[PDB]
């Protein structure tokens, strides 16, 4: 059993990427945000408060013949975003890219925060972190990936995110076609329930590589690259005019500036993020101030290799019984 689905950025900034997923019988197709930094499959639904849905596609569990209430069961989730969502829970048949999983927990939004309501292109999240992070009560549920694992040819998915362009998520196999050279695998710590790993250092542009251990999480569900304040200060030092803004809340740089690339280390290998990836465009419509893609982790508590770093690479999430993270160039 394998599965490939095309994943598509939601806007010209690549803020996020949506993937179509089939839920229910017959299928209702919703566009979900694949999130390797959470563990809940949650969807906008026929129970979602009507003043809280826009032009999202909703999941109607009463039109699925496979859909069943998980009685008493209940969820609540919160994001680094400050984003929130909650409700009750169904099991149903979920399909991604022709890979089918039956009796998947599909967590049906009753409530949803403003940030989600104003995002019309995202119909819900599909969490692909480790199941310990799942939020359903009183009985914790397993992720889609966990439910598929056993059925899979290999207990693996890959992420191949595009810069300004569609990409692919594969399940159960590695497209040797999709990257260049070698995959470099590196150890994953599961203890916090993240795809948590340890980078071996960094370079800015054509600069010397500094060997220093950077611990953080592979998170397809975060837009930006979040790195320690030291690292992030060295990057923007090389961009004339760049400054940390208290008003906008991060580093901004004049839009007419050239952005150096950013290299990070996985084992003895190196991934270069071209500087174009790091431009997130005018902080406001008309401004000549542009928002940077590398921002300080100091206020999160954790470093995040979000989409800015992952879309520079071909990324393997090896969900074996000792999990690993592979990076290749593409």
């Amino acid at each position: 059993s394998t599965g490939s689905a095309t994943t598509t950025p939601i806007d010209s900034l690549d803020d996020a990427y949506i993937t179509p997923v089939q839920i229910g019988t017959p299928a209702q197709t919703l566009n979900l945000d694949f999130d390797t930094g959470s563990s809940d499959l949650w969807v906008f639904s026929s129970e979602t408060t009507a003043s809280e849905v826009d032009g999202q596609t909703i999941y109607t569990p009463s039109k699925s013949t496979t859909a069943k209430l998980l009685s008493g069961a209940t969820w609540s989730i919160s994001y680094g975003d400050g984003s929130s969502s909650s409700g009750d829970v169904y099991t149903d048949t979920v399909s991604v890219g022709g890979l089918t999983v039956t009796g998947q927990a599909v967590e049906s939004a009753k409530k949803v925060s403003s940030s989600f309501t104003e995002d019309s292109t995202i119909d819900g999240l599909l969490g692909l972190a480790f199941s310990t992070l799942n939020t359903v009560s009183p009985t914790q549920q397993k992720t889609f990936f966990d439910n598929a694992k056993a059925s899979l040819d290999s207990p693996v998915f890959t992420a191949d995110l595009g810069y300004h362009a569609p990409g692919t998520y594969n399940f159960g196999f590695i497209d040797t076609t999709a990257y260049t050279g070698s995959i470099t695998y590196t150890a994953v710590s599961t203890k916090q329930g993240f795809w948590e790993w340890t980078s071996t250092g960094y370079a800015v542009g054509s600069g010397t590589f500094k060997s220093t251990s950077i611990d953080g999480i592979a998170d397809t569900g975060t837009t930006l690259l979040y790195l320690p304040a030291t690292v992030v200060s060295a990057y923007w030092a090389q961009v004339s005019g760049a400054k940390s803004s208290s008003s906008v809340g991060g580093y901004v740089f004049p839009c007419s500036a050239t952005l150096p690339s950013f290299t990070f280390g996985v084992g003895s290998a190196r991934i270069v993020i071209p500087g174009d990836y790091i431009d997130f465009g005018p902080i406001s419509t008309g401004s000549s101030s542009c928002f940077g893609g590398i921002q300080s982790s100091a206020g999160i508590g954790i470093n995040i290799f979000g989409d800015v770093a992952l879309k520079a690479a071909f990324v393997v999430f090896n969900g074996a019984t000792t999990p690993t993270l592979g990076f290749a160039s593409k």
Partner: peptide
Amino acid sequence: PLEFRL
């Protein structure tokens, strides 16, 4: 931007 369970 978005930042998915931190």
